Amino acid sequence: CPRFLKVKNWETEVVLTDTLHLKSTLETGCTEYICMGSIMHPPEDVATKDQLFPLAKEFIDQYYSSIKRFGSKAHMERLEEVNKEIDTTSTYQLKDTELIYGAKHAWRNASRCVGRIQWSKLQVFDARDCTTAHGMFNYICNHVKYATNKGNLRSAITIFPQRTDGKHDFRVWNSQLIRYAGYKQPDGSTLGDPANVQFTEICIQQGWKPPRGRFDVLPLLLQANGNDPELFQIPPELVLEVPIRHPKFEWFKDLGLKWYGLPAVSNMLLEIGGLEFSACPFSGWYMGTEIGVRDYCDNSRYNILEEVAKKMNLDMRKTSSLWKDQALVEINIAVLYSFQSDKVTIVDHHSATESFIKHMENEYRCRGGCPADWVWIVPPMSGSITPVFHQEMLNYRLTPSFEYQPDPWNTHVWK
């Protein structure tokens, strides 16, 4: 690799210089001859002593460099203490300061996230003292209450104990803390959210009694210390929701749509200094298109384009009439209107992409770069009238990071 890589914005002509890519840590999947950039994903295999040493040192060095104490006595002592501990226990524990730094930087490093202008403002909840699923339930409830804040949403992460031997993992089996159930019908239709059919079925087998409605908040399915997972009902008063209405179309409310206020993804893995936090639910606030375009208008999701287009009395026989495009806009108008009216934090795709460009420029200037995944950063509607469409980006993997992990029901050893 060369020392300097340049990116260009084809709308503004601004050119930025990236040097941070030199700290790249893992493979992208791309090679010299193929690009895997549109590929979505390109047990007791735990880190050996030898594999762990340099990964720990790398992180510790980076941490002390960030607090302007690189090469200090405290730095050297921390290094030695981490080494001793890896040597005698085959693992090590992070200091609270290091945990907070690591969590914030995994967000900062998350190439697919358009919301990272916010990265340094993250409430970190240290849950490494947790031992049971009931305890996990307590921590998650507190997280949800704090992050929701009566609609004035605050970004937050709760971190449970790291992996040891791979047979004692903490996991949240939910993909997000709050999601709606989906039920496959005998006739092939789906009630509720089709995205969540598999996990809904799992909950039902585990003993969940389903209301069988369109917007049933799923139970938490929580695994502590590698034991079998356990079911819990989130208190309904902790689940903030927004009825979707349209500022012009009075009939829009009659669709009976609502969505939940807090996006809180719970199936990802947090890696810091070679340590693996398999349960680390984190939450921010929504970009409207996430609900209005994907959740509602994806064919294999709620798929309401048809019903909305009908109520708008559009010609639905020619694709070239753009009836889908027109309905898509009104739905996203309704979603933003309904959240803003109920004073629940939400950001539109124009504002968010504009902030991200400012953020990326600042990062290039003060950090020497900003990894970014164009395929994910550009919003799912109106792509080219947002500033990120014309922005060249470089994608690469920095650590600490958030990673994908297999679904736990595919790996769990039932006791």
Add this chain to the structure above:
Amino acid sequence: RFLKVKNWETEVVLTDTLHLKSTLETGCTEYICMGSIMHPSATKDQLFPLAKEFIDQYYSSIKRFGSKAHMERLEEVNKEIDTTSTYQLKDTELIYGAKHAWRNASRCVGRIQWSKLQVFDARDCTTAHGMFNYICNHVKYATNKGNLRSAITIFPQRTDGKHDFRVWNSQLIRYAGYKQPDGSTLGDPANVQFTEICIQQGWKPPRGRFDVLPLLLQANGNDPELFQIPPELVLEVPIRHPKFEWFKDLGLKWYGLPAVSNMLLEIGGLEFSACPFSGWYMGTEIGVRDYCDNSRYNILEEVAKKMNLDMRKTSSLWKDQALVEINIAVLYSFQSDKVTIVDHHSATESFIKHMENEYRCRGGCPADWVWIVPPMSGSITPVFHQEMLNYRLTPSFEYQPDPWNTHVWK
């Protein structure tokens, strides 16, 4: 190794073997992806292997691999690279190579049409006047009174690089852009530089909003020369709206024929620096990018005004609403004047069908997701949810420097 791509909407999985045949670079490395970079950065010796690979796949394509005709062609080519430091393609080869450069064009969503391409051999051309004649014939043919037909015209290949044939226009038909004294821009801002260069070369500009630019044509490395495309050859569409009667009062129009003229065609190591090619428009090319880019005609505000939308906050999505209406009008207007055009929904379905065809008969299809997904309503088109593998196959179309940056005037 074999690679899988998955559609997340339909769960269809395809297997790519075709990528194993590429040897050009993508720009990425194992540690940095450059997927969204627009332009990631011969001799006797270099030429023959390249010529060999091309002939090999041509004779393999007509199922005569290793035939007497095949063997003799290789030898004929080798002798010719020896005695002339280059070689000339057979007509069949020229046609095969042009079609395959299109088939291999990872950024083009229109490739289901790839084998329907009229190839015009212009390799006997020697002067800018001759270039003009060939290009007029191309435009007349491709336009076909609204029933557009894909075509490419191929001018003489690069020799020593001092005698290049170049079309200086980025497209055969484009509108002038003029840098206004008060600061703003009249016409198309994408073309301001080229427009100035035409004026500087003697073109008398009407200084309207839709002035068709003259052709600026360079033959054998000589100074370029100006030509006016006969107006009756330039098909245009007045843009109106099926419900908003005021839309026509905006005075907008566009041309029916998209004909990119500034790329390079490479076939078996040979380089064709002048190779204008044309198809027909996808509506968003005009209605999203050409009209609504900030640095293009930038008409969202005017439209949104006439629609009486709340433009005080972004979250009204007034830009999004105006965007859809403009693209409705563009499609409606071409369709009403019976000029070939495809909407982004129909175009992307066809591309998904094309991908399936190509994976079946060819073992893959190189595709650039960043360019294939339309600039509006992305995820409600089927390509958004389609994993793609991008890789570079030859014959191909490549970018080249703008000629005014290199040309030593005379």
